[PDB]
Amino acid sequence: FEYGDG
Amino acid sequence: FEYGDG
Amino acid sequence: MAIYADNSYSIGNTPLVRLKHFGHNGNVVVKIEGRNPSYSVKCRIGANMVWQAEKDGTLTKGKEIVDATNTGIALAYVAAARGYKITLTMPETMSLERKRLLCGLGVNLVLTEGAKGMKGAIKAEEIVDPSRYVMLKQFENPANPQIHRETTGPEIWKDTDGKVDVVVAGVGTGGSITGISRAIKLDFGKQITSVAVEPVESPVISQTLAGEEVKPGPHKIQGIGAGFIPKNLDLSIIDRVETVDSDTALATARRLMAEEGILAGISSGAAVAAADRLAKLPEFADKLIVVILPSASERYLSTALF
Amino acid sequence: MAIYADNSYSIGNTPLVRLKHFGHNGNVVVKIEGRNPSYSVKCRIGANMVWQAEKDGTLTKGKEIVDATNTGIALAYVAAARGYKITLTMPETMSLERKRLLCGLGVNLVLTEGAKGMKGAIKAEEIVDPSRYVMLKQFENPANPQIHRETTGPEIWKDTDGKVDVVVAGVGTGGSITGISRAIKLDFGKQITSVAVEPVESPVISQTLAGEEVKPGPHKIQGIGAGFIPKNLDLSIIDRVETVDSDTALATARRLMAEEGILAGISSGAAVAAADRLAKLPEFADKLIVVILPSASERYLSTALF
Ligand SMILES: C=C(/N=C/c1c(COP(=O)(O)O)cnc(C)c1O)C(=O)O
Ligand SMILES: C=C(/N=C/c1c(COP(=O)(O)O)cnc(C)c1O)C(=O)O
Ligand SMILES: CC(=O)OC[C@H](N)C(=O)O
Ligand SMILES: CC(=O)OC[C@H](N)C(=O)O
């Protein structure tokens, strides 16, 4: 979820 | 001593 | 008299610095967008999106700005400088110092859930009963790429005396590489190589262009890798796509600091890592490679950068 | 081709921004030294002190830099960019983000006791068996004021088309106001008003000039108020001394952020507070007042500024 995926 | 005085 | 009427007009004219420990015989040059009013490349679009919205009457006194987001910090100082109210949304996952900065600039902040990332942040279209609010929409607002076409690209052309052969830029909204490429290719007529950079963790541009399954993923390179193709990325002027991993991007940013004395952010390391790989190909040996460094490292003190 | 061989050559050319909520009818203009390679005015002297020391052979490959200190962050990026080792000393009391930044730049750090302040930091002359180390001595090294005489002052002259009437600058080493005043008064021949700013908590310039007891004191305005008269402060070109208190300096810096959209440090607020007072005197009503903003607010996220 780091980026996050969005 | 915040500055400090020196 | 070179006196700006407010801080928004002082955007751009960022410097070109030759790298000594990357590339081959000085063929890698970096553009330091850390040296902007609110200290990132987004200063340029924070100003122009607000400017354009004024010019076609959608932004007026008493309207309140909204968007999802460095773009936030850019819109915030412009809102403060020109006297607008502003609400924002940002993924919770972003560095504390950009959280802290927004509050001091007068923003109404609203963090969003990190797992949902930018898509989640864009819980903002939610925000805009209209009439009061206006959403500036950086991912599709054409005023984003055209400020780069009007200033950033020309700055690169002029400072290199037309000698730039390659432009390497990470892609978030895609505004930077689009406007820059359009300027140099269409306005100045030079067939350079435009290189988009994305994380290997979330290579949606590479997968799209290959006609493969688009599978975005989580990564640490703040600024890029939105997990989708943004409208403000003009795929037609992109010649090449390079992927870079988070660890290497971080390591590269640290190297820029300790070996070049350049205070660059995480995405700046990704861009240089990509540029360095192209720069060490014999086909690029006689080519001047210009790399966008989008931000400065003090905005990342709380991150894995430090 | 405007490509710098390393980051040290990209110093200066900082912008002039007109203030809207200070002064009277736009008579207060600010010079944003936050927009420099390591994001403070000291970038200019970090570069030139190192440059000059190279030019007269005291700095060579294998010598290690020392001094006491934003000057540290300036010398550190220059040391990194040009390939020198560097040890530093700094009062413990200074903001964490300048502590954190130095470590990432490759510095050998040595904090000193806060109560002793800068005098204590200058526990550095201790450091320099010679032959290996060279101390650059920012408080007396003439290469400090002369870079301001060569670049900062001329930048102010040119951008105002010779119309600058007043220059307001806080005093640390005194290099800024000295070089700037010498440039505009002696090189360009205009009798401006040079205004030194110091904290009301430690008004040693005011006390000295009044022939009174010099009694320095502690204060929160990082950057200025060394507690003594530095050799690099040329008292002869100082026309006026303004004192400013810490709380007001902090409040003024916050206002610059929220009302002007300018990301300025604590000493920047002191300088503007002083300028604002002069600017609201009828005798200064037709005068263009140029104020040095030495640094940027993200270097103060850990401070009472936020
Ligand atoms: C999307 C934004 N950031 C753009 C950005 C980019 C990508 O630039 P473009 O959006 O123009 O592609 C790269 N690196 C950093 C640190 C960035 O902040 C934002 O601040 O929300
Ligand atoms: C003495 C240094 N600072 C200079 C300075 C000054 C004073 O500038 P001059 O030294 O040129 O007087 C004002 N404000 C800030 C934030 C400063 O860092 C130092 O970084 O150690
Ligand atoms: C700085 C921030 O996270 O935003 C960067 C850009 N909106 C993106 O795709 O992540
Ligand atoms: C930034 C720092 O504390 O140094 C400022 C200057 N040396 C002084 O008199 O304090």
Mapping DSSP onto H, E and C, the string for C174-190 reads CHHHHHHHHHHHHHCCC
| CATH of segment(s) D1-42+141-306 | 3.40.50.1100
Contacts of D212 (CB under 8 A, 6+ apart): none
Q: Are strands C288-293 and C164-170 parallel, antiparallel or unpaired?
A: parallel
Residue D167 Cα, ligand 2 centroid: separation in angstroms? 16
Experimental method: X-ray
| Same fold for the pair D1-42+141-306 and D43-140 | yes
Q: Where are the beta strands (DSSP E) in chain D?
A: 3-4, 16-18, 28-32, 64-68, 85-91, 111-112, 133-135, 164-170, 193-199, 240-244, 288-293
Domain layout of chain D by residue ranges: 1-42+141-306, 43-140
Contact call for C260 and D5, based on CB within 8 A: no
The strand pairing partners of C196, in sequence order, are C169, C241
Q: Which residues of D touch C81 (CB under 8 A)?
A: 260-262
- The span from the CA of C84 to the CA of C290, in Å, is 36
Q: Which residue has the tokens 């988070």?
A: C246
Q: Are strands C16-18 and C28-32 parallel, antiparallel or unpaired?
A: antiparallel
Residue C226 Cα, ligand 3 centroid: separation in angstroms? 7
Contact predicate D264/D277, CB 8 Å? no
Say if residue C10 carries a ligand binding annotation.
no
Displacement of CA C127 from its chain's centroid (Å):
24
D4: nearest CA in chain C?
A: C17
Q: Which residues of C touch D297 (CB under 8 A)?
A: 101, 104
Contact predicate D306/D286, CB 8 Å? no
Structural tokens at position C38: 């609110």
Q: Name residue D183's amino acid.
A: A
Q: Which residue has the tokens 């205009």?
A: D190
Active-site residue flag, D267? yes
Helices C96-104 and D246-260: crossing angle, nearest 10°?
90
- The span from the CA of D138 to the CA of D68, in Å, is 8
Q: Is C86 helix (H, G, I), strand (E, B) or coil?
A: strand
Architecture of the domain whose range is D43-140: 3-Layer(aba) Sandwich (3.40)
Residue A4 C-alpha, separation from nearest chain C C-alpha, in angstroms: 4
Contact call for D261 and C297, based on CB within 8 A: no
Residue D113 Cα, ligand 4 centroid: separation in angstroms? 14
Say if residue C144 carries a ligand binding annotation.
no
Structural tokens at position D63: 């010598």
Resolution, expressed in angstroms to one decimal: 2.2
Contacts of D57 (CB under 8 A, 6+ apart): none
Structural tokens at position C226: 């939105």
